[PDB]
């Protein structure tokens, strides 16, 4: 289908995988990072049935499957499942076999080297990709947003990274990596919905809660005041339709879950929240850097699409920041989808063609080569 | 750049008028055609239902 | 034949009854359904129509 050896681009998180091709401004398909497996003994004969289901197949057949995520806190722990995801992601929907096209995969700046090494090894030895690159997610977000400078908050399902970049340079001493993420927010919601009389303990139930969160939840500009009314009156409650026709009505839990981003103690996390994490990265940068980072809080990854988050993050930093200074958040509608787009931008830059590891250098050096070549 | 914004308003307002019309007219056409059609279907079914009730009474006498 | 006729007549009645019961529940379905059908789309339409204008500020 393609008339050029454009790189293929994927952003593989602990949640979902966004995929498309280099040179576009959008992914063409999205898959959950899920491989599902039946937990029941077959009784009928001749009904097909796979050993495992991938992506959207895993969710469509989930009624009897246990659903596992191969990626946790930013890294691949199960790469056999990622190979099935990548075949499906690159060839079944995008219709391109990596054998004839370069591939770009992404990681956080401090993501364990073992993960970039496996991403490189898998695409070269299983998919025979002619070339590889593993990209920094923060770089990609800044390209997509039109910035060279800012604090990148990649606040998704796995890990919040929080890295300051200035004039294209990393400022690693100011990175505030935090093990606070969207997967934990979901777990908290499952526990508080349990308190309301709706226990969720199985995979189907877990996926429902993640659906409740995505459709009903928000952070709120002012949590304590929003909670004071939501916890006192039905006027701030919203219902959700459960798959079997039953419904659940949710009050302050609707925003208390997302609030864990600002109050991590809700899940037993030793943290002051994502806005102090952001603030400290600015604080630790040089004094003639700080002004540009205060003016550029960059939103990427999941949770950045909660109602009240763009306004809340600018307000929370303003509250920590010195007066006189202008604090600004970069949070357009195309917010968060900035990391996939950046992968496309980087892969297709003329100034980045020399950064591709070819399947020449790869076999001479082995997968450890990514640590020497990507950045 | 500001021409992008003007183009956005041009398409959105051309769409708005196309929409006010399409939103309303697609419903008035589908909806009035649907009730007119089904007002008749409803009447025809009611007539047939009465006729069958009569037919059943006639068979009961037979 | 008498039993088959009674069963068939009983079934003719039950099946025809089911037919007129369903034609009626269907009419009573569809008719009430078209009300939803004609008003849910017209309300939501006209809401969307109005939105194009509601948003003209």
């Amino acid at each position: 289908d393609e008339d050029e050896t454009t790189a293929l681009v994927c952003d593989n998180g602990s949640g979902l995988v966004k995929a498309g091709f280099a040179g576009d401004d959008a992914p063409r398909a999205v898959f959950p990072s899920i491989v599902g497996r039946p937990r029941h003994q077959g009784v009928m004969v001749g009904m097909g049935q796979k050993d495992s289901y991938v992506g959207d197949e895993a969710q469509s057949k989930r009624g009897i499957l246990t659903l596992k995520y191969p990626i946790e806190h930013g890294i691949i722990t199960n790469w056999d499942d990622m190979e099935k995801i990548w075949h499906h992601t690159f060839y079944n929907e995008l219709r391109v076999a990596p054998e004839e096209h370069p591939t770009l995969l992404t990681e956080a700046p401090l993501n364990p080297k073992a993960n970039r090494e496996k991403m490189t090894q898998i695409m070269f030895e299983t998919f025979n990709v002619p070339a590889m690159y593993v990209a920094i997610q923060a770089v990609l977000s800044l390209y997509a947003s039109g910035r060279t400078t800012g604090i990148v908050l990649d606040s998704g399902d796995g890990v919040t990274h929080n890295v300051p970049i200035y004039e294209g340079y990393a400022l690693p001493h100011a990175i505030m990596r935090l093990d606070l993420a969207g997967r934990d927010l979901t777990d908290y919601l499952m526990k508080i919905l349990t308190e309301r009389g709706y226990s969720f303990v199985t995979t189907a139930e877990r996926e429902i809660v993640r659906d409740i969160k995505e459709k009903l939840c928000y952070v709120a500009l002012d949590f304590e005041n929003e909670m004071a009314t939501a916890a006192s009156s039905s006027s701030l409650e919203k219902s959700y339709e459960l798959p079997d026709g039953q419904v659940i009505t949710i009050g302050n839990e609707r925003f208390r879950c997302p609030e864990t981003l600002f109050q991590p103690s809700f899940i037993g996390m030793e943290s002051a929240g994502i806005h102090e994490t952001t603030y400290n990265s600015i604080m630790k940068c040089d004094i003639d850097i700080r002004k540009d980072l205060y003016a550029n809080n960059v939103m990427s990854g999941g949770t950045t699409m909660y109602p009240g988050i763009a306004d809340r993050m600018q307000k929370e930093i303003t509250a920590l920041a010195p007066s006189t200074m202008k604090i600004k958040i970069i949070a357009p509608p195309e917010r968060k989808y900035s990391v996939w787009i950046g992968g496309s931008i980087l892969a297709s830059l003329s100034t980045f063609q020399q950064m591709w590891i070819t399947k020449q250098e790869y076999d001479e050096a082995g997968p450890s080569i990514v640590h020497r070549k990507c950045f | 750049f500001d021409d992008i914004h003007r183009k956005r308003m041009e398409k959105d307002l051309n769409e708005l008028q196309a929409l006010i019309e399409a939103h309303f007219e697609n419903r008035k056409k589908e909806e009035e055609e649907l009730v007119s059609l089904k007002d008749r279907i409803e009447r025809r079914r009611a007539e047939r239902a009465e006729q069958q009730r009569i037919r059943n009474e006639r068979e009961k006498e037979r | 034949l008498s039993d088959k006729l009674k069963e068939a007549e009983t079934r003719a009645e039950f099946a025809e009854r089911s037919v007129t019961k369903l034609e009626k529940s269907i009419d009573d379905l569809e008719d009430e359904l078209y009300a939803q059908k004609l008003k849910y789309k017209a309300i939501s339409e006209e809401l969307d129509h109005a939105l194009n204008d509601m948003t003209s500020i």
Binding site: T324, K326, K328, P332, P333 | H5, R8, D12, L16 | L51, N52, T55, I57
Partner: peptide, 29 residues
């Protein structure tokens, strides 16, 4: 409200930028 989602971004950004300009224009002294 798609019209609003984008008009909202347009006006918040345009007023914030205009306000940032208003504030700087005076603040620069």
């Amino acid at each position: 409200m798609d019209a609003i989602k984008k008009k909202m971004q347009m006006l918040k950004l345009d007023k914030e930028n205009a306000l940032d300009r208003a504030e700087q224009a005076e603040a620069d002294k």
